């Protein structure tokens, strides 16, 4: 469903670069040349709400899309002294489904390098806010007896005595309904709580309050049971209404081809062999490559 902040795509279409409903553009910069691919071609860089995009600005087909849940390090490099003005450069390190890429972005015209700052800022806002768009078990949600609300979140329905049909004897627990996510704590050792976001929900039906996950948190079917079913169907219908009105415009809580092969961070390596034990060092070491030895790789 949502891939803009979860993958890293190359030669993306002119439509997938367009702002998703919940997405929103923040800052832009022209003439940002792309490097780590020596095409020597200019472009335009965009720091959106969920991902960073770069399109060639002359052949807008060739482009890059990097999600914020797939970046590890972002480094700004101020160099290239007096000969001209102090120009910056952006080094982004990315790891998607166990494959490490690195992209470099060179600001050609030294007259507008401010972009490289705001990105950093929003990236923090992307990581400090994951309870908005991700699924978590047993977190630190509950205060003394109440829920700790996110910034853009207020409770809708406050129901006591809502069971959980995934355990045996620690069930009876409160059920908080909010505009961003729905949570249930256990009211007895209140660290068995589940916080499901509307973004991860696929369909709320009955078989009993069955909630299915959207192929990202796996097929996690959650079952709850309440007092006589009047309030039950009431809660189900209001939950479906809130789900649809959210999916209309997502929130995301962010406050404020061979293309891949030319962007590997390792260098001609998209792999990680099976980590096996090492009797030489005593550490878990990556498997050695068909004849190589540790004391032969170490020396020069």
């Amino acid at each position: 469903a949502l891939w803009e902040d979860r993958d890293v795509r190359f030669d993306v279409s002119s439509q997938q670069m367009k702002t998703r409903p919940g997405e929103v553009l923040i800052d832009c910069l022209d003439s940002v040349e792309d490097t780590k691919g020596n095409n020597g071609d200019r472009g335009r860089l965009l720091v959106t709400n969920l991902r960073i995009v770069w399109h060639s600005l002359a052949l807008p087909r060739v482009n890059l899309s990097i999600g914020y849940n797939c970046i590890l390090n972002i480094t700004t490099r101020t160099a290239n002294s007096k000969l001209r003005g102090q120009t910056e450069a952006l080094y982004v390190l990315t790891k998607c489904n166990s494959t490490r890429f690195e992209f470099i972005f060179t600001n050609l015209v030294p007259g507008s390098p401010r972009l490289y700052t705001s990105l950093i800022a929003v990236h923090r806002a992307y990581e400090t806010s994951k309870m908005y768009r991700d699924f978590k078990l047993r977190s630190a949600l509950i205060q003394n007896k109440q829920l700790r609300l996110l910034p853009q979140e207020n409770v809708y329905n406050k129901i006591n005595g809502v069971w959980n049909l995934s355990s045996d004897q620690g069930n009876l627990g409160t059920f908080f309904i909010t505009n961003v996510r729905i949570v249930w704590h256990a009211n007895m050792n209140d660290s068995f709580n589940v916080s499901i976001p509307y973004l991860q929900i696929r369909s709320v039906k009955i078989r009993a309050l069955v909630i299915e996950s959207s192929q990202q948190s796996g097929g996690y079917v959650l079952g709850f049971k309440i007092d006589p079913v009047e309030k039950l169907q009431e809660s189900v219908k209001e939950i479906n209404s809130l789900h649809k009105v959210y999916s209309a415009n997502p929130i995301f809580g962010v406050d404020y081809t061979d293309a891949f092969v030319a962007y590997f961070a390792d260098g001609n390596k998209q792999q990680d062999r099976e980590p096996v034990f090492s009797e030489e060092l005593g550490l878990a070491i990556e498997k050695l490559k068909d004849g190589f030895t540790l004391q032969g790789l170490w020396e020069v």
Binding site: R138, A186, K269, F277
Partner: protein
Amino acid sequence: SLFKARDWWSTVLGDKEEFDQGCLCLADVDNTGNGQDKIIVGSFMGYLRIFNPHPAQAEDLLLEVHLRDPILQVEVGKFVSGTEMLHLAVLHSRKLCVYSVSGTLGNVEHGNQYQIKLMYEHNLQRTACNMTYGSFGGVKGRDLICIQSVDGMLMVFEQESYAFGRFLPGSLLPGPLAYSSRTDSFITVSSCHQVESYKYQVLAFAVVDWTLNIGEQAIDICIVSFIQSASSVFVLGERNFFCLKDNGQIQFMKKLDYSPSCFLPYCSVSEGTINTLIGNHNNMLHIYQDVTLKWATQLPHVPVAVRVGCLHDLKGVIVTLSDDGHLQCSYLGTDPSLFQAPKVESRELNYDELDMELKELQKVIKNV
């Protein structure tokens, strides 16, 4: 990939929280008995988190409890008077708390809950700084706790209550404390560059068993004892790296050219030697055979309190925890990768726009 710390289950651990040494512990606090360890991390922001990682995923975090006062030096040892089952110790600045992580199961991967029970607590008069734990004297099946203080005093609890407490003679800034069992001695590094060992029964009677004037003050001291042949005591200063004998003199020393932050002499290989791994402030791990570098790796973050443990059927996984909040299990990268330009065919050199710009610039040149 060569000389990088390839990634295993990794995570970020809060909202601009802050950790230190002693935070990262790695043992069987669940008392399963299978060998697979479990990560435990407690910041002095308040949250105590326990994980059972599997090779990001939601069900990895066992629990994320929050205590009011900050947390210093979570430990895992037999801190209960009755049984021989591992219990988790949490040292707040003016508080001691032994817990018990009991995990009950449901009929689904995420129907299993985890309860921490306050086995007992201890009000701390002085302000605690750090602590050590061990079988003081020659006792077995018990793990007494010797906590330090920010003002020098060290107070010893015999696993149940306030056994005693003695002031360290002549210390201002409290350094790293450890306990050697092959000599039954509390070993510390005073502010005046003296690595000092005190016999336990000597302190219990209140003095110095021995001293050694190393060139600096130490960040950590780790007495390791999985070798019963020749005992040794490791002392990592802020400029050097000593391995001392049991009488008190340097067995050997390394003059590091970087700034260490953490070290851990883990399981050894050869006869008599001890493999060790140290973490720069330059984001690297170094793996010495007591003086001699055997391997080196580029870490992502500045390692604080590294550990090595068997996590989910993979022995010797290195678990690092930064002080900002990162955490990462990792395995060494041993894949020499060809240095060669990527044979990319899709990405071509756009000759049209480039030739336009080159014609413009060459026109300027040949015109002037």
